[PDB]
Design a binder for this molecule. Structure first.
Ligand code: SF4
Ligand code: SF4
Ligand code: SF4
Ligand code: SF4
Ligand code: SF4
Ligand code: SF4
Ligand code: FES
Ligand SMILES: [Ca+2]
Lengths: 145, 905, 169, 571
């Protein structure tokens, strides 16, 4: 029979997407520095509109102890530990998961959060002042006192 | 003075404010608007302490520690509950409008606002309303602008305007909509605009070049290095990640470059990351290029060197002292030639003779800011030695400092000082072939050919002291301005004479020496500064050797049938046709270089040398200061087949393989001991930094921060097995975080500043004895020579005035901070900031030529006809033609040469 | 498919070896007490724990006492790579000194992860060619370069969209 | 005046007694957050002070701990004597219910201390480990050999100039160590182990194979004359990792010490970090931590009783812990200032189903234990010691209470709101054999189920993380919404939380005795020193003194009766 795993179960790690379908990871490297094993490695790239994303992203699962500190440290909820434990491999080199092996097609355990809806940095589709709890930019040449 | 902080008695300087005094004692007070170099203004209101009237006072009063003098019998409390509450409140008010941007902010992990938010203890938001937002500006290729993150602390405008003297950055608007930026979109014009990325305590101004390949500060591998982009030798912290050089941070040196770099040294590091660099030894066999490892490259090179009759070595002022000495040992002292031209070498050795025999003390870069009058002769200081231009600006503001000190206004109260000294400033007299960037604060600017600048210098020396040779034919108005200069220089307590080899005239240097000698004869506390051209120009001058012309003569006559070229492209010091013919005549050309130069097509062997990021070595300042630079990273850590060794390592092993037919990859301290044994005038470089056996209580010095990430994944795509940590036998530094970087450690080489609670560039306060002073156990570096007991004689070779002769055109050198240097102009981010190739002409000469502004003229130099578009220069003199030195096709050796057949294409 | 250094009986031998596997469970550390025969009789060695420097020789000797054919399964991040103990007294992976056939990530892996490793090892044994006798034919072991498990399961893993939120049991 | 306030404990009567006996200038009293009077003694007065404390009217009878510290890189050493190294001695008085920490300062060129093996015999292994890891010699020690590292080890790994990380592997040294392990029986020299009378010549030396470790046995036929247990085969360098992880990211390593414990091993570390941080946690945090520690204690006790004589009870506990934390064995779920998440919706249903199903299993276990005459003949009377033997050897937990000494940490020195729970402490007669220890563990299982019932029945409503600014990490919804919380989270998960410079200490009742974390902060984001006292160390050292004159099967039964694991011994 299939094994029952609770929703909090710390298993295989994925990178998730936002409700708009774009990857949540802003390549802020907080997961890599919070990893006590140091088995996360990534690099920041930027789109033409200024959106931060990971150029690559790799996890050494042969080193990973599945402690969940990266998911706890993620401020966009991109990286998540999912309830799945079937990860046995023939070669240890195949236990290094690149971004194509981690980026799922959905939001994972957090179905709605979008960090770029809260950030003040302007990306495509969110100009200045269009994020949450943000006023429109008042021009410094305005007539109003 | 005596202060009591929280009941603890401290002894401080009574001329300081309480913020700098308490930061010097290791006490933590949050602050934003104060800078050690910019002074106190009291804007941000963050540094509040509670002052009491006496010991038996309980109610107190909140005072601002940066605007309060640390007088005797002072009673303050930092850890008072009301003071702590108000500091948290100030952080909270700043946090009300701050964007939720830390994961997508380049300042994160390096942010002073992050540090002070954590330090005040504010982590709970009770503000529910909207945040103000701002549009961003385009500030050019180097600085990225994000006005949302601003906390309105006014540090940027205070630095850029009051300190750096720039004019295109300001504060606009009012109550809570204050905006810090340019009046319109465009490139920031100041040569010191890069220091905004460390002055700004938030992420408003960030390194765009680093933002292209961003990594957080804890992920960097840092090393203490010396900037290689001119002769001033500013201390830097280059930091790498994944095998490429990522950032140049400033490294504090209380003697040289304290808080600030220039834009060339900060943003022209990108030649290290070029993908066409030599990464492996390559031997030319027919048309084939065979890649070798280190051993067989050394064997083949040694066999070819042993079968040849004479081997000559052409060094460079780019290469370190150790590399040039290793080449000198490999080829022999009499066969070693400096890679610079004869005229450049003559000017360089005259500058060295003036420095270490003229009996006039040459100041450090920090000490330039205390001189009472400045005369700059021929040297475009802003474009060739830019940090000297910044220090000159501070020395010019010294007059307002003295006026404010006369009214008992404290030295940190910068607004009162700038108010008292409104436009009064110390006398500055610059000379150039055209306008400079110091003309805004210059008391006088002289635009003249180099002969006339030298004649003005000789006339100033003659008027100061009649024993100096007299100048005939001085016009009455020029004599009146010479008398103005003489009255300003004679009355100064501390005059400073700045010149250099970039003006292209021996007589300019002689005139500067004459003015300095005349001022010293009157008992004045005169100092002299010489600006060399490259990072190790004075080291190559001290080492000595023949000129490049002699080496080419040896190659052309056939007396030398093997040439080893070290870190030299040979086209910036000689004509390209002659160099190409001479190297094509030789049956062995071996180029030991780290950049793909044009002479590698003729080369029979190319040794992939290491740049300053991948190597250790010593370089000599323009003031004669020996400074060690350490390797940042191992080039072979990620690419296992990369054979990219130090130049001195290559040459020492080549010498060992020539002598005893075995390779010998030596250690750096062995080469340094060889230098200080064979060359006694370079014996100071032994004390530039301690040896590889130096330990802080038994442990090496760490190159990377203690929270370094990705240890078991940064190379996992190459192999899942973790390689051995790279071994550094050369230096006291380790290629890991298993080491010491404590601020209280007894060392002088600090790879990067970090303290617990201070993750920003404000962490340097912990590594200093007093804030804004020196490092706690002294600055790194050592002067090679002291001031001589006896001076020189007066140089009596006074040139005649410039005669504009028909057909000839005297090439006036124009220097650009972005473009004149070779390696930095190879960096791809500089092509946006580079000027277009424009040949400068007088309106009279261009009208005679029938040429307007913008049309392209063709001129032939050394049998090579090239075409450039004409820019009209009003400040130029007739018979001169302006050329940008160091650019594509225009060698800096053309400075002072004549031109033929300048006609419209 | 490629391999790494008359036919039906080879499949018969492989089926016999595949269905009959006798483990030697090396204790070592806490992966053993998660997952719960002399080495001469056992043909599978399960390294479940940290390879300490003081008992790397013990593991090497008890591996050398086993007889061919022999397979190694490494459970847990410690035996995989050293795990979280990148420290002076810990060997960074048991594949530094013995050859490992199946690796399981986890700290510790579940017992069902060990069952999945047993199935992977069984497929690996079933798809390999070994000498039938030591007097006839090539005396070389032909390991098969099998398709990796993370590339085989890539489609269904990438296709995952929504998971249960962590606020419930 | 909170519990975490820095105190000097000058009102302690031990300070007045030491001042009246040795003079006021004989020692330096240090203000700490250890909760203990810390005094610095001259090295030449150390045995005198120890003998004076051994003979007080309510004497200090137990040496709880003894180890070293490298003080060379410690910058915030204000009010402290000049030391390059130091040796600390934690001594516990049970009648007084107090404890003291003596500290001896040592220069780098003179690293030797007089030995305490004439006062406290557990100082044997403590001083051997201090020599092995710091290089400090103890003069008068019977056999000062390495206990954690192999005898052919270069350097002392807990020194500050010794690199923490793993060096390059070598098959060269591996085959040397293999070849000396093959020739060890041939070249066994019985004074490289502290033995005597080696081959009488009727005596035989063997090696024996809860973790894997060797014990050298000296036999008169089948009677044990002497034995030395060879440990260090499970040494992970956890204390060195304490010096190389941030305060937050060291928590999984605290889990992997005493791997059957989980949250029980998590608890004293976060309690000592919160003492360093000046954090008082709310009541919901206290009850969550107590509930998880009691669940894991029940799991460990069930495993111990099943081993000594099952799978369903531990499976139910593992599903409950897996639902709460996401993991069974090493939850990594306690945080500085609170817990990682809130309790999931449905935790109470699982706990109620576990508590309604457990008492019949407990009745079955009591039937299988106290009514088993074969077990009651096999177990009692063998490897038995009284109160005096247990005190002098640092025995804690079930053995100490089985000697009749009523000392539990949860009652004498309460932590995490254990005084709010009504539970009993089982104490036996005067004899600590296998049988009495097993029944004490059964009674503690019953009391832990009582504590779990009280955790379920009145569970507080409130926060699962403290309001303190040093709570690592801050609550995740405020982190994802508020910029100052995002800043605090950013700097607390990357550089790490900054603990101000102090020394803290927390002892708890672990599943196998008293586990303590002694943390020294140098004001940075990592621990300057992490000292972990584990009870299995002190229990394993008592093995030679308890089976002098028993048989090898009796030694096997004694090994089964002691609750220990090798990760706890070696850490
Ligand atoms: S679960 Fe833990 S060990 Fe694994 S990648 Fe995340 S932080 Fe690293
Ligand atoms: S913490 Fe999250 S957003 Fe930041 S780099 Fe890691 S996965 Fe990406
Ligand atoms: S400026 Fe500092 S506090 Fe503001 S978003 Fe950037 S890192 Fe965060
Ligand atoms: S842009 Fe930066 S330096 Fe300028 S006022 Fe704003 S926060 Fe201060
Ligand atoms: S002034 Fe010269 S040495 Fe200093 S940063 Fe600029 S280029 Fe480098
Ligand atoms: S991988 Fe984890 S569970 Fe397994 S032995 Fe290592 S620490 Fe224990
Ligand atoms: S630092 Fe003093 S008010 Fe800003
Ligand atoms: Ca080197």
């Amino acid at each position: 029979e299939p094994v029952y795993l609770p929703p909090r179960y710390r298993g295989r790690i994925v990178l998730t997407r936002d409700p708009d379908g774009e990857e949540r990871c802003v390549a802020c490297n907080l997961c890599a520095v919070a990893c006590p094993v140091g088995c996360i490695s990534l690099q920041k790239a930027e789109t033409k509109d200024g959106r931060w994303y990971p150029e690559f992203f790799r996890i050494n699962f042969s080193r990973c102890i599945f402690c969940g500190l990266c998911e706890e440290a993620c401020p966009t909820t991109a990286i998540q530990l999912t309830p799945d434990f079937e990860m046995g491999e023939y070669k240890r080199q195949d236990l290094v998961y690149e971004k194509e092996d981690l980026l799922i097609s959905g939001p994972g355990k957090y179905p709605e959060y979008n960090f770029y809806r809260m950030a003040g940095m302007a990306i495509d589709g969110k100009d200045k002042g269009e994020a949450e709890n943000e006023a429109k930019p008042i021009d410094v040449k305005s007539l109003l006192p | 003075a005596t202060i009591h902080v929280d009941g603890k008695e401290y002894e401080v300087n009574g001329a300081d404010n309480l913020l700098e005094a308490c930061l010097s004692l290791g006490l933590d007070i949050p602050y934003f608007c104060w800078h050690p170099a910019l002074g106190s203004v009291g804007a941000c209101r963050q540094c509040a302490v509670k002052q009491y009237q006496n010991a038996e006072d309980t109610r107190g009063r909140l005072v601002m520690s940066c605007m309060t003098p640390a007088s005797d019998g002072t009673f303050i409390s930092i850890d008072d509950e009301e003071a702590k509450q108000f500091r948290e409140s100030v952080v909270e008010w700043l946090m009300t409008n701050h964007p939720h941007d830390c994961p997508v902010c380049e300042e994160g992990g390096n942010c002073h606002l992050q540090d002070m938010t954590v330090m005040t203890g504010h982590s709970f938001r009770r503000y529910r309303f909207t945040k103000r937002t701002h549009r961003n500006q385009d500030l050019g290729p180097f600085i990225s602008h994000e006005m949302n993150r601003c906390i309105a602390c006014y540090r940027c405008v205070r630095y850029y305007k009051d300190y750096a003297g720039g004019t295109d950055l300001g504060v606009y608007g009012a109550h809570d909509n204050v905006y810090f930026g340019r009046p319109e979109d465009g490139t920031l014009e100041s040569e010191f605009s890069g220091n905004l990325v460390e002055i700004c305590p938030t992420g408003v101004f960030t390194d765009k070049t680093h933002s292209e390949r961003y990594n957080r500060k804890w992920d960097m591998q840092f090393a203490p290095s010396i900037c290689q982009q001119c002769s001033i030798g500013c201390n830097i912290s280059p930091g790498e990640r994944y095998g490429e050089l990522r950032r140049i941070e400033n490294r504090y040196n209380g003697t040289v470059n304290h808080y600030f770099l220039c834009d060339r040294g900060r943003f022209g590091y990108g030649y290290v990351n070029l993908k066409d660099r030599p990464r492996q030894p390559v031997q030319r066999r027919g048309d084939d290029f065979i890649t070798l490892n280190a051993e067989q490259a050394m064997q083949g090179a040694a066999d070819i060197l042993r079968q040849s009759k004479k081997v000559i070595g052409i060094g460079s002022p780019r290469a370190s002292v150790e590399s040039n000495f290793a080449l000198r040992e490999l080829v022999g002292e009499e066969n070693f030639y400096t890679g610079i031209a004869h005229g450049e070498q003559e000017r360089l050795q005259l500058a060295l003779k003036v420095l270490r025999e003229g009996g006039i003390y040459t100041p450090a870069l920090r000490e330039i800011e205390s001189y009472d009058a400045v005369l700059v002769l021929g040297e475009d200081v802003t474009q060739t030695g830019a940090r000297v231009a910044l220090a000159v600006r501070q020395a010019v503001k010294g007059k307002a400092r003295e006026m404010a000190a006369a009214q008992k206004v404290a030295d940190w109260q910068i607004a009162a000082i700038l108010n008292i000294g409104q436009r009064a400033k110390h006398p500055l007299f610059v000379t150039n072939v055209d306008d400079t960037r110091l003309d805004d604060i210059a008391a006088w600017t002289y635009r003249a050919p180099v002969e006339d600048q030298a004649r003005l210098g000789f006339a100033i020396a003659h008027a100061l002291d009649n024993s100096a040779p007299a100048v005939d034919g001085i016009e009455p108005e020029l004599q009146s301005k010479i008398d103005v200069i003489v009255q300003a220089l004679a009355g100064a307590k501390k005059p400073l004479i700045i010149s250099g080899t970039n003006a292209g005239s021996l007589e300019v240097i002689q005139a500067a020496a004459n003015v300095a000698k005349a001022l010293k004869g009157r008992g004045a506390d005169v100092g002299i500064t010489m600006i060399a051209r490259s990072v190790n120009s004075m080291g190559l001058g001290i080492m000595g050797g023949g000129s490049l012309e002699e080496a080419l003569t040896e190659l052309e006559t056939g007396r030398a049938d093997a040439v080893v070229v070290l870190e030299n492209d040979l086209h910036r010091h000689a004509s390209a046709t002659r160099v190409n013919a001479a190297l094509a005549k030789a049956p062995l050309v071996m180029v030991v270089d780290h950049q793909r130069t044009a002479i590698m097509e003729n080369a029979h062997l190319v040794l992939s040398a290491a740049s300053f990021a991948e190597s250790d070595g010593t370089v000599i300042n323009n003031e004669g200061r020996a400074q060690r630079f350490f390797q940042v990273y191992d080039p072979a850590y990620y690419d296992s087949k990369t054979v990219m060794l130090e130049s001195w390592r290559w040459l020492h092993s080549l010498h060992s393989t020539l002598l005893s037919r075995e390779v010998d990859w030596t250690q750096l301290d062995h080469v340094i001991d060889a230098v200080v044994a064979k060359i006694p005038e370079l014996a100071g470089i032994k004390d530039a930094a301690p040896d590889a056996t130096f330990r802080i209580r038994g442990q090496k010095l760490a190159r990377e921060p203690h929270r370094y990430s990705g240890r078991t994944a940064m190379r996992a795509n190459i192999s899942v097995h973790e390689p051995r940590q790279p071994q550094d036998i050369d230096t006291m530094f380790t290629f890991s975080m298993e080491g010491n970087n404590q601020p209280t450690a007894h060392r002088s080489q600090v790879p990067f500043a970090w303290a617990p609670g201070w993750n920003s560039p404000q962490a340097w306060n912990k590594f200093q004895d007093e804030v804004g002073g020196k490092l706690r156990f002294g600055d790194p570096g050592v002067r090679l020579f002291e001031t001589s007991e006896n001076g020189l004689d007066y140089f009596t070779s006074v040139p005649a005035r410039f005669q504009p002769q028909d057909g000839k055109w005297r090439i006036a050198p124009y220097y650009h901070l972005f473009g004149s240097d070779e390696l930095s102009q190879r960096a791809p981010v500089f092509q946006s900031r580079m000027p277009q190739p424009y040949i400068k002409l007088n309106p009279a000469d261009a009208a005679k030529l029938g040429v307007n502004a913008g049309t392209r003229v063709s001129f032939s130099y050394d049998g090579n006809t090239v075409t450039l578009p004409v820019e009209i220069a009003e400040g130029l003199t007739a018979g001169q033609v302006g050329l940008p030195m160091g650019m594509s096709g225009i060698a800096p050796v053309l400075a002072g040469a004549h031109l033929e057949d300048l006609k419209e294409a | 498919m490629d391999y790494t250094l008359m036919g039906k009986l080879n499949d018969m031998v492989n089926w016999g070896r595949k269905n009959s596997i006798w483990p030697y469970n090396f204790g070592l550390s806490c992966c053993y007490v998660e997952m719960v025969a002399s080495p001469r009789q056992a043909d599978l060695m399960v390294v479940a724990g940290t390879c300490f420097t003081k008992m790397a020789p013990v593991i090497q000797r008890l591996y050398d006492q086993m007889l061919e054919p022999k397979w190694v399964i490494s459970m847990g991040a410690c035996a995989n790579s050293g795990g979280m103990y990148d420290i002076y007294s810990v060997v960074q992976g048991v594949d530094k000194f013995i050859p490992v056939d199946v690796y399981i990530p986890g700290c510790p892996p579940r017992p069902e992860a060990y069952m999945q490793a047993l199935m992977l090892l069984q497929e690996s044994i079933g798809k390999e060619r070994r000498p039938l006798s030591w007097v006839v034919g090539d005396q070389g072991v032909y390991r098969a370069n099998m398709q990796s498990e993370r590339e085989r399961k890539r489609g269904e893993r990438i296709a995952v969209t929504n998971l249960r939120t962590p606020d419930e049991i | 005046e909170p519990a975490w306030q820095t105190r000097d404990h000058l009102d302690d009567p031990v300070i007045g007694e030491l001042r009246n006996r040795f003079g006021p200038d004989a020692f330096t009293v240090q203000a700490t957050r250890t909760g203990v009077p810390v005094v610095w003694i001259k090295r030449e007065q150390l045995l005198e002070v120890g003998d004076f404390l051994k003979k007080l009217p309510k004497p200090y009878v137990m040496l709880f701990d003894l180890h070293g510290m490298d003080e060379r890189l410690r910058t915030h050493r204000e009010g402290l004597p000049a030391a390059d190294f130091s040796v600390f001695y934690h001594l516990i008085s049970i009648d007084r219910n107090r404890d003291i920490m003596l500290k001896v300062a040592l220069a780098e060129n003179d690293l030797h201390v007089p030995t305490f093996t004439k006062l406290f015999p557990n100082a044997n292994w403590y001083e051997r480990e201090t020599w092995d890891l710091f290089g400090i010699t103890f003069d008068g020690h019977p056999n000062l050999r390495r206990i954690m590292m192999p005898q052919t080890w270069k350097g002392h790994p807990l020194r500050k100039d010794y690199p923490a990380r793993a060096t390059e592997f070598s098959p060269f040294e591996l085959t040397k160590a293999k070849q000396d392990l093959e020739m060890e029986a041939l070249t066994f020299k019985p004074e490289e182990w502290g033995m005597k009378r080696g081959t009488n010549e009727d005596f035989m030396f063997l090696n024996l194979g809860h973790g894997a470790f060797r014990i050298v046995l000296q036999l008169d036929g089948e009677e044990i004359v002497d034995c030395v247990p060879d440990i260090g085969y499970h040494h992970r360098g956890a204390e060195k990792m304490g010096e190389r992880q941030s305060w937050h990211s060291y928590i999984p390593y605290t889990d992997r010490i005493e791997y059957l414990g989980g949250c029980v091993n998590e608890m004293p570390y976060v309690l000592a970090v919160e003492k360093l941080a000046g954090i008082t946690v709310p009541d919901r945090v206290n009850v969550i931590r107590v509930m998880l520690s009691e669940l894991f204690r029940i799991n460990s006790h069930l495993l111990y009783i099943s081993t000594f004589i099952a799978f369903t009870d531990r499976q139910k506990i593992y599903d409950l812990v897996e639902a709460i934390t996401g993991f069974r064995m090493h939850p990594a779920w306690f945080r500085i200032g609170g817990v990682a998440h809130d309790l999931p919706r449905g935790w109470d249903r699982l706990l109620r189903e576990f508590l309604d199903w457990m008492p019949k299993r407990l009745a079955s276990y009591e039937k299988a234990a106290l009514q088993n005459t074969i077990l009651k003949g096999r177990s009692q009377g063998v490897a038995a010691y009284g109160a005096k033997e247990a005190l002098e050897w640092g025995t804690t937990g079930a053995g100490l209470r089985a000697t009749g000494i009523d000392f539990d940490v949860r009652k004498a020195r309460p932590y995490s709101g254990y005084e709010n729970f009504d539970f009993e402490i089982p104490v036996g007669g005067g004899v600590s054999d296998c049988y009495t220890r097993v029944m004490l563990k059964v009674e503690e299982l019953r009391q832990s189920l009582r504590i779990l019932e009280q955790c379920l029945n009145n569970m507080p409503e409130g926060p699962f993380k403290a309001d303190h600014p040093l709570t690592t990490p801050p609550p995740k919804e405020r982190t994802l919404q508020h910029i100052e919380t995002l800043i605090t989270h950013f700097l607390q998960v990357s550089w790490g939380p900054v603990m101000p410079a102090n020394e803290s200490f927390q002892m708890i009742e672990a599943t196998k005795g008293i586990n303590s974390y002694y943390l020294t902060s140098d004001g940075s984001t990592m621990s300057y020193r992490t000292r972990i006292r584990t009870p299995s160390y002190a229990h394993l050292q008592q093995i030679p003194a308890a089976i002098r004159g028993s048989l090898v099967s009796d030694l096997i039964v004694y090994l089964g009766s002691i609750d220990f694991v090798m990760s706890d011994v070696d850490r």
